[PDB]
């Protein structure tokens, strides 16, 4: 996260660290959506252009974390992957359309003060909150700037941006399964996600039931916190049918 702040203890209890076994390194962010299911971006596991193709045994998910590097004894839980499920129509060839993946845990993770699942929106949650100008929250252990690493989980609140401004910011072909967020140059304020933040969640707090919903997933952008550029996020509601399908049948 660029131009964000240190999160508070337990401010993002759904926050998941995708961790690489050997060499031990951060792979990506992710979110906890039940005691057995974790959500992230498909590119965190599959990205042929870079020779990225991880399977279950290549990694661990680390939940309840706050500090990036430390092993948070008696706080985090480290879970093993039983199975990875990547969106069949995920488009890594052109524009990362449908950048989303599900990961099933081998055993259930126990909830606690620091570990809790976020909600997924339904049609009305989406429609009532996916509005230009409404701010969401993005959290992550990624790069502090485009071109070091933070000691603790970082957070930034960013306004959702109108579709045409999103399109007019980039040469890339934008789909219905994405949205962009970030301040305009003229708004003065700053902030974006960056490398290492990938797969983490974009959440919003509904003013109706006061619950946090994950509306987006960190997926891509041109540089980080670049003037006139915006972060692009996977539209989680637009792909809800697929999340239910996978949950339903496995």
């Amino acid at each position: 996260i660029v131009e964000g702040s240190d999160a508070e203890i337990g401010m993002s209890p759904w926050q998941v660290m995708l961790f690489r076994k050997s060499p031990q390194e951060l792979l990506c962010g992710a979110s906890l959506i039940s005691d057995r299911w974790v959500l992230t971006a498909a590119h965190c596991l599959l990205y042929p252009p870079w020779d990225k193709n991880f399977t279950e045994n290549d990694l661990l998910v680390r939940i309840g974390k706050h500090s990036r590097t430390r092993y948070e004894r008696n706080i985090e839980k480290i879970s093993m992957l039983e199975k990875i499920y990547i969106h069949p129509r995920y488009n890594w060839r052109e524009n990362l359309d449908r950048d989303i993946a599900l990961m099933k845990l081998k055993k259930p993770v126990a909830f606690s003060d620091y570990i809790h699942p976020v909600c997924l929106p339904d049609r009305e949650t989406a429609a009532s909150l996916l509005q230009a100008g409404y701010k969401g929250r993005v959290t992550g252990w990624g790069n502090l700037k485009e071109t070091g690493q933070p000691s603790v989980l970082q957070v930034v609140n960013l306004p959702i941006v109108e579709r045409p401004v999103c399109k007019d910011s980039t040469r890339i072909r934008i789909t219905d399964n994405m949205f962009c967020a970030g301040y305009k140059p003229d708004e003065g304020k700053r902030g974006d996600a960056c490398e290492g933040d990938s797969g983490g969640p974009f959440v919003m707090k509904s003013p109706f039931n006061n619950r946090w919903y994950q509306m987006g997933i960190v997926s891509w952008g041109e540089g980080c916190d670049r003037d006139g550029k915006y972060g692009f996020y996977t539209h989680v509601f637009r792909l809800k049918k697929w999340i239910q399908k996978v949950i339903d049948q496995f």
Binding site: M11, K135, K205, W212
Partner: peptide, 28 residues
């Protein structure tokens, strides 16, 4: 169904330092 309710915040009626900024952006 218990989702989106954080133990150290919503469960105890405490707010975090920047959530009100989200709320003020939700003007509808």
């Amino acid at each position: 169904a218990d989702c989106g309710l954080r133990p150290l915040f919503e469960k105890k009626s405490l707010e975090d330092k920047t959530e009100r900024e989200l709320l003020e952006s939700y003007i509808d």
